[PDB]
Design a protein around this ligand. Sequence first.
Ligand SMILES: [Cl-]
Ligand SMILES: [Cl-]
Ligand SMILES: [Cl-]
Ligand SMILES: [Mg+2]
Ligand SMILES: [Mg+2]
Ligand SMILES: [Rb+]
Ligand SMILES: [Rb+]
Ligand SMILES: [Rb+]
Ligand SMILES: [Rb+]
Length: 136
Amino acid sequence: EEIIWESLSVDVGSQGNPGIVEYKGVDTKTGEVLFEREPIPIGTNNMGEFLAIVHGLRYLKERNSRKPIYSDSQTAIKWVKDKKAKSTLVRNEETALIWKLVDEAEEWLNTHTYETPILKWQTDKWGEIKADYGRK
RNA sequence: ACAU
DNA sequence: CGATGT
Ligand SMILES: [Cl-]
Ligand SMILES: [Cl-]
Ligand SMILES: [Cl-]
Ligand SMILES: [Mg+2]
Ligand SMILES: [Mg+2]
Ligand SMILES: [Rb+]
Ligand SMILES: [Rb+]
Ligand SMILES: [Rb+]
Ligand SMILES: [Rb+]
């Protein structure tokens, strides 16, 4: 219904899908960029959306912050809930890095706890999430 | 269909 | 127009 402004918003950006993937997290209220991942040569939109949420969880936990996380990705929210990124991307030498990071993010989820609400950013009502890359 |  | 996902 209403935006929870006291929150962290995350999003993927890419060049191609599959293609070069990056992600970032921003303060929903101010747009301040709080973290940005260096581009990964090949990944998918959904893998990057998943990594962005898990990075947000780790970022907030390290800082003892109870803020929720907004994501625009129905898929990645479910993958985090399930602790399992069900990507179709081939696992090969070219995709090794993204898959390593996804595997490590799942491993983190399986070894840590959090109460962080992971909320759907309602793009249809609120416009683009504040972490968006402005590329579409 | 919906979400990217 | 193409792609990734539930
Ligand atoms: Cl990562
Ligand atoms: Cl909340
Ligand atoms: Cl959702
Ligand atoms: Mg997104
Ligand atoms: Mg975006
Ligand atoms: Rb902590
Ligand atoms: Rb964009
Ligand atoms: Rb979107
Ligand atoms: Rb589709």
